[PDB]
Every structure is written in structure tokens, then in C-alpha cells.
Write a protein that binds this DNA or RNA. Sequence first.
RNA 1: CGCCACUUCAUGGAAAUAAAUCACUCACGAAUGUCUU
Length: 145
Amino acid sequence: MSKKGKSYVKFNMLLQKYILKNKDQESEKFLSSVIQMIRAHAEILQIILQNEDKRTEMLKNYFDNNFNESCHLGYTGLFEDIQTLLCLRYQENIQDYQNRNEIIQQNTILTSDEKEILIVSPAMDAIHTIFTALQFIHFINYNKD
RNA sequence: CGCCACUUCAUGGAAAUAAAUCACUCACGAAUGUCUU
């Protein structure tokens, strides 16, 4: 992650919000089903992120339409927070890496394998960052009773 | 007042329409992090 922008701040706030504190008055009820949804729907999320004009609306609609059950009314805050973090991370990633990717691909000396090692996809990198943050939250929160 | 019967036996419309389309949980846990010549 890049500590330059508000993505780092939102990441820290998400960790603070959805990580359980020790018994003492209530937390924000982290949901673990979103972890596997992001992994499974990663390519669809990439398609949504690549849509510049309707990115936020498409992300919100996708999360609402996938998590459309009665239980999910309590996880609207989590959905909104992860949507904001994903959008911020994608914007930072494109700003940092777009021209770098174009110039790396246009280079003729570098081999294809080294090109693919050097080239990073902004949308997929942001999705992986969200996935790793949620996995860390779940790892801290869960205990084998 | 008497005498006397025939005819007709279903057509037109509606022939499925909306809601929910998987949800939650677990996503690895424990042992071994070197040992014997």
C-alpha cells in the first residue's frame, strides 16, 4: 500500500473499526462472507473498477445485489467502507502505475517474463489489498473455541 | 267448436403473472523447525 494518500487512512480506520476488542460496548459486526465474495468476484470487480464514469455506482449496486438478504442490513457500513477503500486504492494505483506499465510494455530490451513481473495491474492490486485487509481482520477476530 | 305441430342445442375472451435464485459459519487446526551415525 501507498502511505501517501487517504487509502492508508481508510485502511487503518477499517482495521480499527472491524477488529474485536477484548471483553469489557459493542463492535461493528464484521462479516466473513465478503472475504470469499471479493476473491471469487475479483474479475467482475476489475471490470467495475475499469468503468470510469459509473465506478462508484456500479460498485455499490454490485455489493447491494450480491448481499441482498435480511442479515446484510447490519453490514452496510462494512460494505460502504470497503467500497471507499477499493475506489481510493484503484485511483492511487492508476495514478502511480499507468504510465509505468505503458512504458514497461513499450520497452524492447526486457523479456516477457520480466515484463510481467514488473507490470502490476492497478485494479487487481487494489482488490488484493482489500482481500488481505479483510483476511487480517478475520484472522485477528476469529478464535477456535 | 272441431282438428293439428314444427324450429333452435356454444360461441367469443383470459391459457399463467410477480417475489425470493442460495444465505450464515468454518477457508485449514495440532505435531515436527531437524534427528541418528
